[PDB]
Symmetry: C4
Subunit: 70 residues, 4 copies
């Protein structure tokens, strides 16, 4: 009865330690992550950037200029 | 009254605790097993540029113009 | 009040317990309802390249070149 | 022995208090952000729109225009 209470109160207490441990880990992990918007905005910048280079590199001009004669 | 009441409540605390523990464990498991968004975003970007590169390097619109200049690609 | 003290405190643990349980569920609910980022990345990847392919294949610039060359586009 | 129970109940109560706060944080942190769907969608929208602005701007035409606006 009182031993029963004691036992169960301990189990609660140790269970409560591990719960706390993991909660911290969760708060840590989430805090570490970079903002979705930020990751997006930068990867989105890299997509346009690269493709812009390719576009401005004008790959399809050589063929035309040959038919014309430049 | 009191200790019997106390003991009953303690037992409900113990079990409630047990499931919360399990649920927390799962949230940790779920977040932890997810590959970083930055890493994911990058591989998919790699596909996007790569595939639009194949297209632009295929010069789709040249074909129309070379035709007007009586020649073929 | 020893039993009283123990009583009042165990009761409070039990209250807090309930609302912690609620909030842990709301967290699980939130993460659970997320699409797998990989999958929803694929969808969006396709639409970007799709929409773009449409425009480039439509060949917007050709009309300018043709008219400069001296030809009517069809 | 009743004291140990009393003592331990309070350590239980106080940890409870601080876990309550941390979960509330985790909820707030997870709440403080739009779905990954919405985010992707607006970004993708900007991606295409800027590349559409680029292409419709016809960067390569100026080169050929001088090649056409020229003589042997």
């Amino acid at each position: 009865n009182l031993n029963q209470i004691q036992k169960e109160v301990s189990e609660i207490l140790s269970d409560q330690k591990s719960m706390k441990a993991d909660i911290k880990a969760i708060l840590e992990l989430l805090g570490s992550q970079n903002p979705i918007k930020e990751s997006l905005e930068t990867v989105a910048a890299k997509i346009v950037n690269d493709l812009t280079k390719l576009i401005n590199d004008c790959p399809c001009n050589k063929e035309i200029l040959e038919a014309l004669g430049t």
